[PDB]
């Protein structure tokens, strides 16, 4: 499991009360409770800046509040300070083990204004169909800051089985770019009616769709 679901990115202004969260596939919470909020810093100490829901460990600033609503378990930084920008993680034990961490909420100090991902889904060219392979490519571009969820739907139904995301870059234009793909062989490509790419940003999902032809 990950199950602990986390919002792709967090950006904030210096003074901003950035809340953060976790929500859970299957089940475990309802029994479980007592979850731990982390802070990863750029190739530096991964500190447990919260333990059991809102117990701050000694030395941790009081701003670092933590909460839980029921399935959504929160964090909440009050008055973002510069040195606050980091890769904050989330976690929950299950039973005798089962340390399941959430996906990974990257937080940000706002340099440049907020950018939203232009997503362009590319279908498998004819010549490619000619070679007896098939690859749709989802280009994410012109966004800030570079934490994006990238999910694939085959006719809505989630495909998590031939997918391949890329970690962001920073474009000469000073904004960012990323780009998932999906490898197939033509059968299933031809035998599903549609395929979509969906990317999550700061309060925005985009899902764009693609369907087959056989033009050449």
Ligand X SMILES: N[C@H](Cc1ccccc1)C(=O)O
Q: In the set 14, 27, 41, 44, which binds a second copy (CB under 8 A)? A: 44
Residue with tokens 């117990």: 55
99 binds ligand X (CB under 6 A): yes
- Closest separation between CB of residue 170 and a second copy, Å? 7
Stretch that binds a second copy, among 9-17, 43-51, 108-116, 151-159 (CB under 8 A): 43-51
User: Site size for ligand X, by CB under 6 A?
Assistant: 8
39 binds ligand X (CB under 6 A): no
Distance in angstroms (rounded) separating the CA atoms of residues 10 and 213: 40
34 part of the interface to ligand X, by CB under 6 A = yes
Instruction: Tell me how far apart the alpha carbons of residues 133 and 138 are, in angstroms, rounded to a whole number.
Output: 17
CA dist., res. 64 & res. 21, Å (int) = 13
Choose among a second copy, ligand X, none what residue 166 binds, the Cβ cut-off being 5 to 8 Å by kind: a second copy
In 3D space, the residue among 108, 104, 71 whose CA is nearest the CA of residue 86 turns out to be 108
Backbone conformation region of residue 26, classed left if phi is above 0, alpha if psi is from -120 to 50, else beta: left
- Consecutive H or E run containing 189: helix 186-190
Where b means 16+ CB within 10 Å and e means fewer, 151-178 reads: bbebeeeebeebbebeebeeeeeebbbb
**Cα dihedral sign, 133-196-201-39:** negative
Q: Is position 107 an interface residue for a second copy (rule: CB under 8 A)?
A: no
Count CB-CB contacts under 10 A for residue 100: 21
By CB under 8 A, the count of residues binding a second copy is 54
Sole window of 18-26, 76-84, 116-124, 190-198 interacting with a second copy (rule: CB under 8 A): 116-124
Q: Does 193 bind a second copy (CB under 8 A)?
A: no
Q: Which of residues 119-148 bind a second copy (CB under 8 A)?
A: 120, 122-123, 125-126, 128, 133, 135, 137, 139, 141
List contacts with a second copy (CB under 8 A): 2-3, 36, 38, 40, 42-48, 51-52, 55, 57-58, 87, 89, 96-99, 101-104, 120, 122-123, 125-126, 128, 133, 135, 137, 139, 141, 164-167, 169-172, 177-179, 181, 210, 213, 215-216
List contacts with ligand X (CB under 6 A): 34, 36, 48, 51-52, 91, 93, 99
């Amino acid at each position: 499991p990950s199950a602990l679901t986390q919002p792709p990115s967090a950006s904030g202004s210096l003074g901003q009360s950035v809340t953060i969260s976790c929500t859970g596939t299957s089940s475990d919470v309802g029994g479980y409770n007592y979850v731990s909020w982390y802070q990863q810093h750029a190739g530096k100490a991964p500190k447990v800046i919260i333990y059991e829901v809102n117990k701050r460990p000694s030395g941790v600033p009081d701003r670092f509040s933590g909460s839980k609503s029921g399935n959504t378990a929160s964090l909440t930084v009050s008055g973002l300070q510069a040195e606050d920008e980091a890769d904050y993680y989330c976690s929950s034990y299950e039973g005798s083990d089962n340390f399941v961490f959430g996906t990974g909420t990257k937080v940000t100090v706002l340099g440049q204004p907020k950018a939203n991902p232009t997503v362009t889904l590319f279908p498998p060219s004819s010549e490619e169909l000619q070679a007896n392979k098939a690859t749709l490519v989802c280009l994410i571009s012109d966004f800030y800051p570079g934490a994006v969820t990238v999910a694939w739907k085959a006719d809505g139904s989630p495909v998590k089985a031939g997918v391949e995301t890329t970690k962001p870059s920073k474009q000469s234009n000073n904004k960012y770019a990323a780009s998932s793909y999906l490898s197939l062989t033509p059968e299933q490509w031809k035998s599903h009616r549609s395929y979509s790419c969906q990317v999550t940003h700061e309060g925005s999902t985009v899902e764009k769709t693609v369907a087959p032809t056989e033009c050449s």
